[PDB]
Symmetry: D2
Subunit: 391 residues, 4 copies
């Protein structure tokens, strides 16, 4: 049998909440359920049609058994739905979509949900099993230990990024200009109503207090442009460039897509939003993660036979402003086509979610016939990339 | 393009260590490295031929960033190798092989490594992020919270087993006889030298201490048959059936397979061990996970037009003695063909590893031309299954 | 019968009492101690170098660092030659400190001492046992609950022990609630009347990048709603309860310190003493029966000096629970209008190591020349301390 | 004018064996060891339990012991519920300060009979987590032995690190310290084998269900040494030019001591033979880093107060917190080393910190001959010391 064609029929997300902020009372799995239910409703299909589900999720500790199963059953999908939780660090939300697309291509399912989720607010601390050492011990923060420290270099991702800043001569002022640009694009996009088909609101309910309706991203309002060039370079004391403002932040969120074969969309009288054309993974030295998305994108372009000029919009995940700048520079692409409506530096980075969010954003924002290319770096030196065409 | 045929070229595992036992000093990722290196060596190929790696791993908290990447880089594979860590609870090791097979089928890669790893000895305790409540702070055990507790019913997996024992009328004495039979068959297989090609020895090195070489599974010797019928029923104190002897145990270990397209196997002139014929996932009501493998197994047989009599060897993961008995009862298959060389009740159950182990064991044990079927239940009500044919 | 030095109080000063996790919660108990000690020496009008030795009550010492009293004393700018001892008689600690200091002075072993109490319940930690973590997890215990508030022998809270006395003496919820509202009413009236002008010193809380906060009065007494008082649920006993959050004492932060000296030393230093310490005693009963131990301790002191209850102008019976004060009133048969007249621990709060010192300090200021004041304080384990002073 | 005080005598002094850290007595909480010593002392004194009027116990690391540690020890020994109790903390000096404060009450005539002593279970001291919000990046669990017991607040370093400062100042080298340490072990073994603690120490039965009873009858720590290894050990408290080692410093331990104290009049009334009279005592303090020299001043204060000369003292007990401390005291006071710590001390017997001040006073009581004077001194964290002079009856 030949490979099946895969289409995106809907793509939906929660707003992104700030660390210990507006969505911090909700577990990752509950945000998961909200996004999945929303995506199914938007697709207009019976929920029974969804055959299987993959969700990205990096910091699974303390979330309870089978996080994807919790999200799926919490969304009211049938108990017959198999579930798998995916961890490619920062690339998790994209890799879930890629893996689901592989199952569909093989004809192993005809309809799936794929996406990502993360509640950094609820990630716990850990104590080693065993006897306590004389003199005491520090219980580690799993955001730091599992999420943000490179194993091999024993330093923060932010300190790894400094290496690329040095090698490619990307200065503090340029990184700060990029970050201000992201905040500006995010605000403009929200004010133009550009997220109306993408984001669904969340109602946070507390006993004995009034409901809070969270309807937009929280992070992009937390900025003061006049203070941006005043911040300390917290990942490197001497000759540093990366700051809290020009780096991504810690956040909570979930996103979900309904994926089908072309045959299934036809059978169900669904008009799909976009076609999944191709995808790829690349890896380089762990310290050099900022540059892996260049190679992953180049792989996809070469596979399909497109030139960079053929791409209408780029989503290069804003793990740090430095990452986007390194990518624009190496690929020599028009900066006006890159992260047009903001990104992780200003919208925030719930790590397991962002790779799904950026694909969902292209699905809504591209115009008919246009190609969009999303790419996302990950801890350990990896990246994933994906090319879609709007239908 | 047409779908590619997938073959298993090698299948290797560490011995399985007991909880806080012979392998407890090694992190899961290090066991992973050991199995991966061993599988590549047994396949007779250069490490550079391995294109991408997926490993099952359920309890990832505190292991550090990107566990699969740590396993792969730790085995000396190229920095160019993309890695993804897979969590379908107890089914994780088999689902990793299934998902890698799908990538190979699509022609997206030609050689991959897939398997699973777990060090339950090193799984930590957690403390919640936030304000310390008045009156005390609880530190939860991630083995219990994420590993072994059903979310929806708020009971241990062993209490779900008790529920199936009720519904299917599977008694304590029946579960005890099965367990004694598992311990018996494990010892017989080790004595017969049946793991000589499957298992590779682990050298444990401690500064200022003599090297310890771990060459065989630890768990199967930890039993007293005279005491089996006297043990307390820990999941249900009154009229119970499940005990520590007749349930699987907590353990440490890793397993890894080298998988290739038929075309790659020919190009590299390797001798494949088995072909992957079919695989499937099923899911049922969470409390009924013991019976999910019955549906998964039925799906694979129907998919390829084989009847249950056509299967020479069954591996139904021994999560509990109850599970195997339930499967035999529903499928009406010959017990003499099931878990013939022991299983998880007597060999142990490093949860993310077991689904890979049982597929590897069929690859070694089957005679040329024979079909083997492996199935494995998972927390949340799921199961995975795979059918292979020995070459 | 021994011939002893006469012991006088020259000053008695305290911080305001802060609410749990409230206005003074950023300050360690030892820092509150330094503030009270410095304040009392200033009020005494003596050189810091004249203080020979220091004793401080402090019940929950875990995580405060080595030698809490030493930290408070050196932190107050007293000489490195000053010996220090930290005292623990649970709730009675602040009073027992004064008693033991008085005993050294009587023996002529020192001529001038500082004695008091300190507690920061906001900063009391949780504990984890030494050893290996059990499979399945563990609860780390709260030291306020484990060391401060739980009876060892009955394995229940002090509040539950108090329910026992409520039963035996027929002291009902209504009477307890009425006593509590009275305490809150009296605390407010005293604060408004400026009755704490000489006793309390303000504390300035400083946080980098934020404005200063001057805490100049007790925080707790304003945290009440009289309308809700009779509607509160009984936390220590669901079945036939009487004790509630409102009519029991609360968790709090504060410190108190008194400058004590021999009558001779006061003359040498040309300072006018405020009061004379006449007598003091400890008593104990069954652990569960701690509410009634103060009756026996007070009687011992009266019998020792040969006075009668009517001779006492002012009583301070520590308000650990409203129940406690009512039990004492009933058994002693004293005039409730002479008891805790300017409020107490039910409305002002109860930093456990400090309250015993606070109540003696209050008598010192409030008594009129020539009058006798009796202070008594129950403690965890079935104990009580009591003290008689006479205004000078 | 000086007050006219009652005379105070020691009628008994009893202790548990001292257990090693996580060693033979580690299953027993401090308060239980307290109960055993308190019952011991009463039984030895030959008086009814109801005669004891009030109790003071030294105890430095009280976290997690439960409410009112001294009350627990007392009620656990079967004393009347009518017995008032107070727990004392002068760090390392606690066990001696308890006896002094009880002596002051008796002198005043406020009680006629009391029990005073000290207790510590370092094996059972817990770890702590702070109340509040968990800070991003991790949460510390501190060891209370280190945080409350052994760390100087002001200098932010270990007691042993402060000790190095006096080693420097008084030129006391590694070899002299090691010689002292070996001397302590030698004395301890000699005394134990001679049966010198026959009336001082009482045995402890450890019961574990299923296990055979363990009877701990002698001090555990003194056998834990190898003299050939002593000179080879690393100086763990200072990188450069260190002198303090695990071998020549005191160890972490468990134990309790209790003394029955009464007025001369009560001993007559009760027809019991007093062991010693408590003559004088004092507290001294210096710069916190200089705690090893504090006992020098406290001892001098006592001798000056009673009008005695150093030469008049038959037996000295200078607490062996560190070998360094004893040598610094031998140096500054210029006393006869053969008269100091005759039957061993904390370097070889161990240092359950709230107990040790009581143990050493209890030791003089048993060891002195009729009419002899003994001086006991003990340094404490923060730069203090207590000292006591007694005379055998
Ligand atoms: Cl990767
Ligand atoms: Cl599932
Ligand atoms: Cl008491
Ligand atoms: Cl001191
Ligand atoms: K930012
Ligand atoms: K078993
Ligand atoms: K209250
Ligand atoms: K030693």
């Amino acid at each position: 049998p030949t490979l099946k064609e895969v289409v995106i029929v809907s793509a939906t997300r929660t707003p992104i909440g700030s660390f210990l902020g507006s969505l911090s009372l909700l577990p990752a799995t509950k945000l998961g359920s909200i996004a999945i239910q929303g995506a199914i409703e938007k697709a207009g299909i019976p929920k029974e049609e969804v055959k299987e589900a993959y969700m990205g999720n990096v910091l699974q500790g303390g979330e309870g058994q089978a996080p994807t199963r919790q999200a799926v059953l919490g969304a009211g999908l049938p108990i017959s739905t198999p579930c798998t939780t995916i961890n490619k660090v920062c690339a998790s939300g994209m890799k879930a979509i890629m893996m689901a697309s592989q199952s569909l291509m093989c004809g192993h399912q005809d309809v799936m949900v794929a996406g990502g989720m993360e509640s950094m607010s609820n990630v716990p601390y850990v104590m080693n099993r065993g006897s306590t050492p004389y003199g005491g011990v520090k219980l580690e923060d799993l955001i730091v230990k599992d999420g943000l420290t490179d194993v091999y270099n024993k330093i923060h991702m932010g300190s790894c990024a400094e290496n690329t800043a040095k090698k490619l001569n990307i200065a503090r002022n340029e990184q700060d200009a990029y970050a201000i640009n992201s905040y500006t694009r995010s605000k403009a996009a929200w004010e133009a109503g550009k997220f109306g088909n993408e984001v669904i609101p969340v109602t946070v309910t507390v006993k004995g207090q009034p409901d809070v309706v969270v309807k937009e991203d929280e992070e992009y309002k937390r900025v003061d442009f006049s203070k941006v060039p005043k911040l300390k370079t917290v990942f490197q004391k001497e000759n540093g460039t990366v700051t809290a403002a020009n780096a991504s932040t810690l956040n909570d969120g979930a996103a979900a897509l309904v994926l089908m074969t072309a045959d299934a969309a036809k059978r169900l009288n669904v008009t799909p939003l976009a076609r999944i054309v191709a995808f790829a993974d690349a890896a380089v030295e762990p310290i050099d993660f900022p540059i892996a998305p260049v190679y992953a994108a180049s792989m996809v372009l070469k596979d399909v036979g497109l030139k960079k000029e053929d791409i209408a919009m780029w989503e290069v995940n804003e793990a740090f402003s430095l990452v986007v700048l390194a990518n624009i520079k190496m690929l020599e692409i028009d900066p006006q086509k890159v992260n047009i409506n903001g990104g992780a530096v200003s919208l925030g980075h719930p790590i397991g979610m962002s790779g799904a969010r950026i694909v969902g954003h292209l699905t809504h924002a591209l115009k008919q016939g246009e190609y969009g290319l999303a790419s996302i770096c990950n801890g350990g030196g990896g990246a994933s990339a994906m090319l879609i065409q709007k239908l």
